Nucleic acid binder design. Structure first.
Length: 184
RNA sequence: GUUGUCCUCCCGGGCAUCGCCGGGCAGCUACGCCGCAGCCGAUAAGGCCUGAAAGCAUCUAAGGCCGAAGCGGCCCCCGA
Protein backbone atom coordinates (compact mmCIF):
# COMPACT_ATOMS: atom_id res chain seq x y z
CA UNK A 1 0.00 0.00 0.00
CA UNK A 2 1.63 3.38 -1.03
CA UNK A 3 0.05 6.18 1.11
CA UNK A 4 -0.52 9.82 0.18
CA UNK A 5 -3.46 12.01 1.13
CA UNK A 6 -4.19 13.56 -2.31
CA UNK A 7 -3.82 10.73 -3.79
CA UNK A 8 -3.11 12.21 -7.07
CA UNK A 9 -1.18 11.45 -10.28
CA UNK A 10 -0.87 13.75 -13.29
CA UNK A 11 -0.93 13.12 -17.05
CA UNK A 12 1.06 15.40 -19.34
CA UNK A 13 -0.99 16.26 -22.38
CA UNK A 14 0.79 17.88 -25.52
CA UNK A 15 -0.55 20.78 -27.68
CA UNK A 16 -1.53 18.18 -30.25
CA UNK A 17 -3.98 16.44 -27.90
CA UNK A 18 -7.01 18.16 -26.33
CA UNK A 19 -8.94 16.18 -23.65
CA UNK A 20 -12.46 16.72 -22.63
CA UNK A 21 -14.00 15.38 -19.58
CA UNK A 22 -17.63 14.70 -18.70
CA UNK A 23 -17.58 12.89 -15.33
CA UNK A 24 -15.90 9.56 -15.54
CA UNK A 25 -15.98 9.48 -19.24
CA UNK A 26 -13.03 10.51 -21.39
CA UNK A 27 -12.83 11.57 -25.13
CA UNK A 28 -9.48 12.30 -26.68
CA UNK A 29 -9.18 14.10 -30.01
CA UNK A 30 -5.98 15.15 -31.79
CA UNK A 31 -5.21 15.88 -35.43
CA UNK A 32 -6.56 12.56 -36.48
CA UNK A 33 -9.85 11.01 -35.46
CA UNK A 34 -11.16 10.69 -31.88
CA UNK A 35 -11.35 7.77 -29.50
CA UNK A 36 -13.74 7.44 -26.43
CA UNK A 37 -13.45 5.27 -23.32
CA UNK A 38 -15.33 4.90 -20.13
CA UNK A 39 -13.03 4.72 -17.18
CA UNK A 40 -15.04 2.78 -14.56
CA UNK A 41 -13.84 2.25 -10.99
CA UNK A 42 -15.49 3.73 -7.80
CA UNK A 43 -14.29 7.10 -6.56
CA UNK A 44 -11.77 8.07 -9.30
CA UNK A 45 -12.71 11.41 -10.95
CA UNK A 46 -10.87 12.52 -14.09
CA UNK A 47 -10.89 16.27 -14.81
CA UNK A 48 -8.72 18.81 -16.59
CA UNK A 49 -6.57 21.23 -14.46
CA UNK A 50 -5.23 23.59 -17.25
CA UNK A 51 -3.13 21.74 -19.78
CA UNK A 52 -2.86 18.89 -17.47
CA UNK A 53 -5.24 15.97 -16.90
CA UNK A 54 -5.52 14.76 -13.19
CA UNK A 55 -6.80 11.36 -12.15
CA UNK A 56 -7.54 11.42 -8.29
CA UNK A 57 -9.35 9.66 -5.36
CA UNK A 58 -9.15 10.84 -1.73
CA UNK A 59 -8.32 7.57 -0.14
CA UNK A 60 -5.16 5.53 -1.03
CA UNK A 61 -5.60 1.77 -1.26
CA UNK A 62 -3.63 -0.71 -3.29
CA UNK A 63 -6.35 -1.61 -5.73
CA UNK A 64 -6.90 1.98 -6.53
CA UNK A 65 -3.34 2.83 -7.52
CA UNK A 66 -3.13 0.06 -9.98
CA UNK A 67 -6.36 1.07 -11.80
CA UNK A 68 -5.30 4.74 -11.75
CA UNK A 69 -1.99 4.03 -13.51
CA UNK A 70 -3.76 1.79 -16.11
CA UNK A 71 -6.01 4.83 -16.98
CA UNK A 72 -2.89 6.99 -17.23
CA UNK A 73 -1.48 4.39 -19.72
CA UNK A 74 -4.74 4.29 -21.75
CA UNK A 75 -4.37 8.15 -22.14
CA UNK A 76 -0.87 7.78 -23.11
CA UNK A 77 -1.72 5.20 -25.88
CA UNK A 78 -4.31 7.73 -27.15
CA UNK A 79 -1.68 10.57 -27.30
CA UNK A 80 0.52 8.60 -29.68
CA UNK A 81 -2.54 6.96 -31.35
CA UNK A 82 -4.57 10.03 -32.22
CA UNK A 83 -1.32 11.91 -33.48
CA UNK A 84 0.05 9.46 -35.93
CA UNK A 85 -1.37 5.96 -35.06
CA UNK A 86 0.08 2.55 -34.20
CA UNK A 87 1.73 -0.04 -36.54
CA UNK A 88 2.37 -3.70 -35.65
CA UNK A 89 4.02 -5.73 -38.43
CA UNK A 90 3.28 -9.45 -38.70
CA UNK A 91 4.76 -12.32 -40.79
CA UNK A 92 2.96 -15.29 -42.38
CA UNK A 93 5.46 -18.15 -42.17
CA UNK A 94 4.74 -21.54 -43.74
CA UNK A 95 6.21 -24.91 -43.42
CA UNK A 96 5.22 -26.26 -46.78
CA UNK A 97 2.44 -24.40 -48.34
CA UNK A 98 2.37 -21.12 -50.25
CA UNK A 99 -0.24 -19.50 -48.01
CA UNK A 100 -2.37 -16.86 -49.44
CA UNK A 101 -3.24 -13.87 -47.22
CA UNK A 102 -5.69 -11.38 -48.76
CA UNK A 103 -8.12 -8.86 -47.28
CA UNK A 104 -11.49 -9.50 -48.75
CA UNK A 105 -13.75 -6.79 -47.30
CA UNK A 106 -13.88 -6.12 -43.53
CA UNK A 107 -12.49 -9.49 -42.79
CA UNK A 108 -8.95 -10.86 -43.51
CA UNK A 109 -9.09 -14.31 -45.08
CA UNK A 110 -6.14 -16.78 -44.92
CA UNK A 111 -6.31 -19.66 -47.25
CA UNK A 112 -4.28 -22.70 -48.05
CA UNK A 113 -3.12 -23.07 -44.47
CA UNK A 114 -1.94 -26.65 -44.01
CA UNK A 115 -3.40 -27.75 -47.47
CA UNK A 116 -6.97 -26.86 -46.10
CA UNK A 117 -9.82 -26.43 -48.48
CA UNK A 118 -11.72 -24.24 -46.07
CA UNK A 119 -11.43 -20.50 -45.44
CA UNK A 120 -10.11 -19.09 -42.24
CA UNK A 121 -11.31 -15.65 -41.23
CA UNK A 122 -10.76 -13.26 -38.38
CA UNK A 123 -12.46 -10.00 -37.56
CA UNK A 124 -11.15 -6.47 -38.31
CA UNK A 125 -12.36 -3.60 -36.24
CA UNK A 126 -13.92 -0.19 -37.61
CA UNK A 127 -10.76 1.85 -36.81
CA UNK A 128 -8.21 -0.63 -38.08
CA UNK A 129 -6.86 -1.03 -41.72
CA UNK A 130 -4.97 -4.19 -42.78
CA UNK A 131 -2.59 -3.95 -45.65
CA UNK A 132 -0.72 -6.97 -47.04
CA UNK A 133 2.45 -6.42 -48.97
CA UNK A 134 4.05 -9.88 -50.08
CA UNK A 135 4.20 -12.15 -47.02
CA UNK A 136 4.65 -9.20 -44.72
CA UNK A 137 1.36 -7.74 -43.52
CA UNK A 138 1.14 -4.68 -41.37
CA UNK A 139 -1.78 -3.90 -39.24
CA UNK A 140 -2.25 -0.24 -38.91
CA UNK A 141 -5.01 1.84 -37.08
CA UNK A 142 -5.75 4.79 -34.68
CA UNK A 143 -5.63 2.80 -31.49
CA UNK A 144 -3.26 0.42 -29.88
CA UNK A 145 -5.94 -1.57 -28.02
CA UNK A 146 -7.85 -2.05 -31.19
CA UNK A 147 -4.75 -2.85 -33.26
CA UNK A 148 -3.50 -5.29 -30.72
CA UNK A 149 -6.93 -7.11 -30.74
CA UNK A 150 -7.18 -7.32 -34.61
CA UNK A 151 -3.63 -8.77 -34.86
CA UNK A 152 -4.27 -11.35 -32.21
CA UNK A 153 -7.63 -12.42 -33.76
CA UNK A 154 -5.60 -13.31 -36.87
CA UNK A 155 -3.14 -15.42 -34.87
CA UNK A 156 -5.90 -17.20 -32.85
CA UNK A 157 -7.53 -18.31 -36.17
CA UNK A 158 -4.33 -20.04 -37.43
CA UNK A 159 -3.92 -21.72 -33.97
CA UNK A 160 -2.59 -25.25 -33.98
CA UNK A 161 -2.13 -27.51 -30.96
CA UNK A 162 -3.71 -30.65 -32.40
CA UNK A 163 -0.34 -31.89 -33.63
CA UNK A 164 3.25 -31.33 -32.50
CA UNK A 165 4.23 -27.75 -31.94
CA UNK A 166 7.90 -28.20 -33.08
CA UNK A 167 7.29 -29.62 -36.53
CA UNK A 168 4.21 -27.60 -37.45
CA UNK A 169 4.69 -23.88 -37.11
CA UNK A 170 2.40 -22.87 -39.89
CA UNK A 171 0.73 -19.48 -39.12
CA UNK A 172 0.91 -15.69 -38.90
CA UNK A 173 2.75 -14.40 -35.90
CA UNK A 174 3.70 -11.16 -34.20
CA UNK A 175 7.24 -10.14 -35.42
CA UNK A 176 6.53 -6.72 -34.23
CA UNK A 177 4.08 -5.12 -31.74
CA UNK A 178 5.91 -1.80 -31.15
CA UNK A 179 9.14 -3.37 -29.90
CA UNK A 180 10.14 -6.85 -31.25
CA UNK A 181 8.82 -9.83 -29.17
CA UNK A 182 10.63 -12.24 -28.26
CA UNK A 183 13.67 -14.42 -27.67
CA UNK A 184 12.98 -17.73 -26.10
C1' G B 1 -61.12 -78.74 -51.16
C1' U B 2 -62.03 -82.61 -47.56
C1' U B 3 -62.55 -86.74 -43.30
C1' G B 4 -66.45 -88.46 -39.95
C1' U B 5 -71.57 -88.51 -39.47
C1' C B 6 -76.98 -86.87 -39.76
C1' C B 7 -81.04 -85.04 -42.95
C1' U B 8 -83.48 -91.53 -48.14
C1' C B 9 -80.74 -89.80 -52.63
C1' C B 10 -79.85 -85.21 -55.29
C1' C B 11 -78.85 -80.30 -54.02
C1' G B 12 -78.34 -77.32 -49.71
C1' G B 13 -76.74 -77.66 -44.65
C1' G B 14 -75.54 -78.97 -38.81
C1' C B 15 -71.57 -80.42 -35.43
C1' A B 16 -66.71 -82.32 -34.39
C1' U B 17 -66.61 -74.92 -30.11
C1' C B 18 -62.18 -71.57 -36.53
C1' G B 19 -63.59 -79.62 -37.93
C1' C B 20 -58.83 -80.01 -40.83
C1' C B 21 -56.77 -78.12 -44.99
C1' G B 22 -55.99 -74.14 -49.37
C1' G B 23 -56.74 -68.90 -50.70
C1' G B 24 -57.85 -63.86 -48.93
C1' C B 25 -60.79 -57.99 -49.06
C1' A B 26 -61.59 -54.08 -45.47
C1' G B 27 -59.04 -53.00 -40.88
C1' C B 28 -54.98 -53.56 -37.43
C1' U B 29 -50.19 -54.55 -37.50
C1' A B 30 -44.00 -55.45 -39.06
C1' C B 31 -40.73 -58.93 -40.49
C1' G B 32 -42.81 -53.24 -44.55
C1' C B 33 -42.59 -47.78 -45.59
C1' C B 34 -42.25 -42.61 -44.45
C1' G B 35 -40.12 -38.55 -41.51
C1' C B 36 -36.68 -37.01 -37.18
C1' A B 37 -31.70 -29.84 -38.88
C1' G B 38 -28.87 -25.87 -39.29
C1' C B 39 -28.20 -21.33 -36.88
C1' C B 40 -27.76 -17.35 -33.00
C1' G B 41 -27.07 -15.44 -27.72
C1' A B 42 -24.69 -16.06 -23.27
C1' U B 43 -20.72 -19.23 -20.91
C1' A B 44 -16.95 -23.30 -18.80
C1' A B 45 -12.28 -25.65 -19.48
C1' G B 46 -8.68 -23.05 -22.66
C1' G B 47 -6.30 -19.29 -25.94
C1' C B 48 -5.35 -13.88 -26.00
C1' C B 49 -5.25 -7.83 -25.90
C1' U B 50 -4.39 -3.56 -23.32
C1' G B 51 -2.56 -3.24 -18.91
C1' A B 52 -0.91 -2.00 -13.89
C1' A B 53 0.05 -3.40 -8.69
C1' A B 54 5.80 -4.65 -8.93
C1' G B 55 8.85 2.41 -13.77
C1' C B 56 9.74 -3.88 -17.00
C1' A B 57 7.22 -8.42 -17.70
C1' U B 58 2.28 -10.22 -17.51
C1' C B 59 -4.37 -13.49 -20.37
C1' U B 60 -6.92 -10.17 -14.83
C1' A B 61 -5.67 -6.93 -10.63
C1' A B 62 -10.15 -3.30 -13.70
C1' G B 63 -11.66 -3.20 -18.92
C1' G B 64 -11.91 -5.94 -23.76
C1' C B 65 -11.98 -10.57 -27.99
C1' C B 66 -13.08 -15.76 -28.89
C1' G B 67 -14.32 -20.31 -27.02
C1' A B 68 -18.52 -27.27 -25.22
C1' A B 69 -22.49 -32.56 -27.64
C1' G B 70 -23.61 -28.65 -21.93
C1' C B 71 -27.34 -23.62 -20.87
C1' G B 72 -31.10 -20.39 -23.41
C1' G B 73 -33.24 -19.60 -27.94
C1' C B 74 -34.56 -22.22 -32.53
C1' C B 75 -38.07 -27.07 -32.84
C1' C B 76 -41.85 -30.47 -31.04
C1' C B 77 -45.95 -31.52 -27.19
C1' C B 78 -49.54 -29.38 -23.86
C1' G B 79 -51.47 -25.18 -22.27
C1' A B 80 -57.84 -19.15 -20.08
Amino acid sequence: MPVDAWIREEVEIPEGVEVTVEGYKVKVKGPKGELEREFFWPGIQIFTEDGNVVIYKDFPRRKDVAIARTFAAHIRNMIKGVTEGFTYKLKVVYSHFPISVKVQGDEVIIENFLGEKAPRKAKILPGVTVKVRGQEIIVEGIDKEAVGQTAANIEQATRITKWDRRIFQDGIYIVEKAGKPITF
